[PDB]
């Protein structure tokens, strides 16, 4: 659904384990802010951003999938029609990285095959607590057909780069 004034509208979703930084990543990208305190989760919602790429004005409708679910019945409805995903883990939390394949399986189950994915090792500022080497993220991203970046919502490292790369690969696939 393209709004007047835009050339495209791409739905993007942030997915991954609880506490990897999804809500923070979206808050940094959309509002260029960070909250150093616990914020309550009250449900799934989106924020918008405009990107100018490939000579077009692109509206991004970017969905935060909110908290963990007991029954994965609500988040997964929003995967339908998504042009892209940020599949996020925390470089300081091994379990969040071990979960990547499960999230990737969900992408394939609930979204069309041409949905694009960037694997994001968030919290790259936490080098003192790193447990997931970037090379391990890159290897898995290559295995699964995803782009890859390390980033930090907290320090505003590679947040723009992640979204812009995702928009680029979406545009490339669209022109196949």
Ligand X SMILES: Nc1nc2c(ncn2[C@@H]2O[C@H](COP(=O)(O)OP(=O)(O)O)[C@@H](O)[C@H]2O)c(=O)[nH]1
* Token reading at 156: 């505003």
- Return the range that interacts with Mg ion (CB under 5 A); candidates 22-30, 127-135, 151-159, 160-168: 22-30
Task: Read off φ and ψ for residue 21, nearest 5 degrees.
Answer: 115, 20
Structure tokens at 135: 């090379």
**Residue of 24, 75, 111, 116 interacting with ligand X (CB under 6 A):** 24
Rounded CA-CA distance 136/14 in Å is: 21
User: Smallest distance, Å, CB 62 to ligand X?
Assistant: 13
Among 84, 152, 158, 163, binds ligand X (CB under 6 A): 152
**Contact predicate 92/130, CB 8 Å:** yes
Could you tell me the smallest distance in angstroms from the CB atom of residue 68 to ligand X?
Answer: 8
After which residues is the backbone of the chain broken at C–N > 2.5 Å? none
Whole-number minimum distance, CB 112 to Mg ion, in Å?
A: 25
Are 112 and 149 spatial neighbours (Cβ–Cβ below 8 Å)?
no
Per DSSP bridges, beta strands 116-122 and 45-53 are: unpaired
List 154, 162, 167, 170, residue binding ligand X (CB under 6 A): 154
5 is in an annotated binding site: no
The answer to the question of residue 24 lying near Mg ion (CB under 5 A) is: no
Measured from the CB of residue 95, what is the shortest distance to ligand X in angstroms? Answer: 13
- Of the candidate residues 82, 153, 167, 170, the single one contacting ligand X (CB under 6 A): 153
Residue 23 touching Mg ion (CB under 5 A): yes
Task: Please name the helix (run of DSSP H) or strand (run of DSSP E) that holds residue 149, with its range, or none.
Answer: strand 147-150
Instruction: Name the phi and psi angles at 117, rounded to 5.
Output: -140, 135
- If binding is defined by CB under 5 A, does position 158 make contact with Mg ion? no
**Given the rule CB under 6 A, which residues bind ligand X?**
18-24, 122-123, 125-126, 152-154
Annotated binding residues for GTP: 18-24, 36, 40, 67, 122-123, 125, 153-154
Annotated binding residues for Mg(2+): 23, 41, 64
């Amino acid at each position: 659904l393209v709004p007047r004034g835009s050339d495209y509208m791409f739905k993007l979703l942030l997915i991954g384990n609880s506490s990897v930084g999804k809500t923070s990543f979206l808050f940094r990208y959309a509002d260029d802010s960070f909250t150093p305190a616990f914020v309550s989760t009250v449900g799934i919602d989106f924020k918008v951003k405009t990107v100018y790429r490939h000579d077009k004005r692109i509206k991004l409708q970017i969905w935060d999938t909110a908290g963990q679910e007991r029954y994965r019945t609500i988040t997964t409805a929003y995967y339908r029609g998504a042009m892209g995903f940020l599949l996020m883990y925390d470089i300081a939390n091994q379990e969040s990285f071990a979960a990547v394949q499960d999230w990737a399986t969900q992408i394939k189950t609930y979204s069309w095959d041409n949905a694009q994915v960037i694997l994001v090792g968030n919290k790259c500022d936490l080098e003192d607590e790193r447990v997931v080497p970037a090379e391990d993220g890159r290897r898995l991203a290559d295995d699964l057909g995803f782009e890859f970046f390390e980033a930090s919502a907290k320090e505003n490292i590679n947040v723009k780069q992640v979204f812009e790369r995702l928009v680029d690969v979406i545009c490339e696939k669209m022109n196949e």
